[PDB]
Design a protein around this ligand. Structure first.
Ligand SMILES: CN(CCCCc1ccccc1)CCC(O)(P(=O)(O)O)P(=O)(O)O
Ligand SMILES: CN(CCCCc1ccccc1)CCC(O)(P(=O)(O)O)P(=O)(O)O
Ligand SMILES: [Mg+2]
Ligand SMILES: [Mg+2]
Ligand SMILES: [Mg+2]
Ligand SMILES: [Mg+2]
Ligand SMILES: [Mg+2]
Ligand SMILES: [Mg+2]
Lengths: 357, 357
């Protein structure tokens, strides 16, 4: 049912946007249908976990069935703002990471009749829609300002996190626009501390904290919860969530994930990379620096192998257990003064813990 | 004094941005350096015509000591929001139009140590900053919602224009995300009405209509002018402005313009291109199609050669005169009830009419 009306509001939004493009932007049918396909390919195709969470939080907190419908509808729009925001990130992300597949299908910039230059712009259009839809529905809403302040900061912090992610192969001390530099060879920068910063900003905020806050805002209950504990949980579940993505990027079959990993080729500072270098032996670390950050398959195979050889799946489990009980503890601290919020928060966790996706 | 006070609020804005990233975003001194240089290289180097216009419009309309400098500061912030927005477009546009030089210096993505994927993200960062500085300085001003609504609007419509720009060289009938097609061979879609559409949306709104609008907003004078006549002026000055951009791309010397043209290699629907086709003879129209859209040295020269012989200046000066006359009378309509405003519009026109760069 949540998923039912979630798709109903999607159609509203798609109608409003595309129609306006024809009525107020002098757009021709061919281009109007192109945006439809671009929208559907990039926004539909996922499990909508960020969007659906907003509804759950809103519903779980609204405790005259109009107030219920008001909060419900708004929660769905706020739901699609993040889904569209995620749609925006992934389009640009796939481009930057030179990815091939996304959600079982080719990445947007990989579509035969979608140019890279146009893909970039579509990615921007996606971001502009979040604002366009919000302004259309929340027009006369007391929280409109607060909603967008927090929405944009999260977007901003996520872009910053992508700065950290995109520039982790480079010795930050040799980071100067006017002078080039190649992939690091010592990987001194590949530290858990540098990994944690990357993940906290590029993933955590928009994937866990944002969905929670928007649901709290439409529910007019933000001041009721302990924003501090809530923040601690969002960062914790966020990191964990990203650590999973990193392992799945290397071990989960492309068809089960719906995308072909590029971390090894892109010499990304993944969790698997910083955890390996931290425990591996002289020879292991050497064979790594010699085969990492390359497209060659025997070079790629080597890095995959070396990961297994080093048994990272065991470090993972210990990490997962650490988080699992750290999350449980925080939720109990939250459950004390806000049981309604506590429940919705645990559902988000349960959707994360040991996911295969 | 305007430029000076404008350039000081700049630092006041840069300080805030970078110092925030140092503590609240956990950024290392190196990346804070990289962003400072990026911010200075992408937001500085131009002539600041959009920002400066906002200040002029604003102080021209305040008709209480500090009340004045208050409005003066607000106008400078808005001035930089557009400059930053323009900086955002220009980085993403040089990447899209695969340009080489910008404002004298090499395009941002062309910089020695600026990777394309990072460049893309830096541009997104530049956009994020327009919202960041806005909320910081205007979190108390009542006009904030409108100010940001009108801002995102123009921003949206501009991305929509960029959509017409990048898809103009392709027969929109075969436009379909799954099947690729070459650059239109017949160039049938290169019509003046289609040119007018792309121009009105990718230039007019944010280059002319926005500065006037923000200036009216920060001065609380928005409702004292005939928006209908104001928009007619913006759309008219914007088209003309963009038409000059196209001519300068083919005929103005790089060292003076500050950039190397790419409209001919990118097979862009330029004013020169549509005006040519609309008058050229069979031979000319034929040879045109055989050399346009290529990156080859001599072919590109052949296109200029056909542009000159087609005597496209005679139509330009005629067009300019047609516009000059149409703008004049519109400005008079404005003067009737908005003298002060009309005056600021004269200056803006004065900076557009026969500009060189
Ligand atoms: C959290 N991440 C990026 C969020 C993208 C954030 C962003 C911000 C600004 C501009 C572009 C993208 C999402 C996970 C990944 O995308 P995926 O595995 O889906 O490719 P990656 O592992 O490559 O990070
Ligand atoms: C006003 N125009 C930007 C249009 C860019 C619009 C845009 C860019 C990126 C994202 C959204 C919209 C500016 C003129 C050009 O930039 P330039 O000659 O400076 O390259 P172009 O002739 O390429 O348009
Ligand atoms: Mg990435
Ligand atoms: Mg990726
Ligand atoms: Mg990944
Ligand atoms: Mg362009
Ligand atoms: Mg360009
Ligand atoms: Mg140009």
């Amino acid at each position: 049912m949540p998923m039912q009306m979630f798709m109903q509001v999607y159609d509203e939004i798609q109608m409003f946007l595309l129609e306006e493009l024809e009525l107020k932007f002098d757009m021709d049918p061919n281009r109007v249908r192109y945006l439809r396909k671009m929208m559907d390919t990039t926004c539909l195709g996922g499990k909508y976990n960020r969007g659906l969470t907003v509804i759950d939080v809103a519903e779980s907190l609204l405790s005259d069935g109009a107030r219920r419908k008001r909060v419900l509808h708004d929660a769905c729009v706020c739901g699609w703002m993040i889904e569209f925001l995620q749609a925006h990130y992934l389009v640009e992300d796939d481009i930057m990471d030179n990815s091939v597949t996304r959600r079982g299908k080719p990445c947007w910039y990989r579509h035969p009749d979608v140019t890279v230059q146009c893909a970039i712009n579509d990615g921007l259009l996606l971001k502009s829609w979040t604002h366009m839809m919000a302004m259309h529905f929340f027009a006369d809403r007391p929280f409109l300002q607060d909603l967008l302040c927090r929405f944009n900061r999260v977007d901003y912090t996520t872009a910053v996190g992508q700065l950290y992610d995109v520039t982790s192969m480079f010795d930050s001390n040799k980071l100067d626009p006017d002078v080039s530099q190649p992939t690091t060879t010592d990987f001194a920068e590949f530290t858990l501390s540098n990994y944690k910063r990357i993940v906290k900003y590029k993933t955590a905020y928009y994937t866990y904290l944002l969905p929670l806050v928007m649901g709290l805002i439409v529910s007019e209950a933000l001041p009721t919860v302990d924003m501090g504990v809530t923040e601690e949980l969002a960062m914790l579940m966020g990191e964990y969530f990203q650590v999973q993505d990193d392992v799945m990027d290397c071990f989960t079959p492309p068809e089960r994930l719906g995308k072909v990993g590029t971390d090894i080729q892109d010499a990304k500072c993944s969790w698997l990379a910083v955890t390996f270098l931290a425990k591996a032996s002289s020879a292991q670390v050497a064979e790594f620096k010699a085969n990492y950050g390359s497209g060659d398959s025997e070079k790629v195979a080597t890095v995959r192998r070396l990961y297994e050889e080093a048994d990272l799946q065991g470090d993972y489990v210990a990490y997962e257990a650490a988080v699992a009980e750290q999350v449980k503890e925080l939720i109990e601290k939250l459950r004390l003064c806000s049981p309604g919020f506590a429940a919705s928060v645990e559902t988000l966790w349960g959707k994360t813990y040991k996911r295969q996706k």
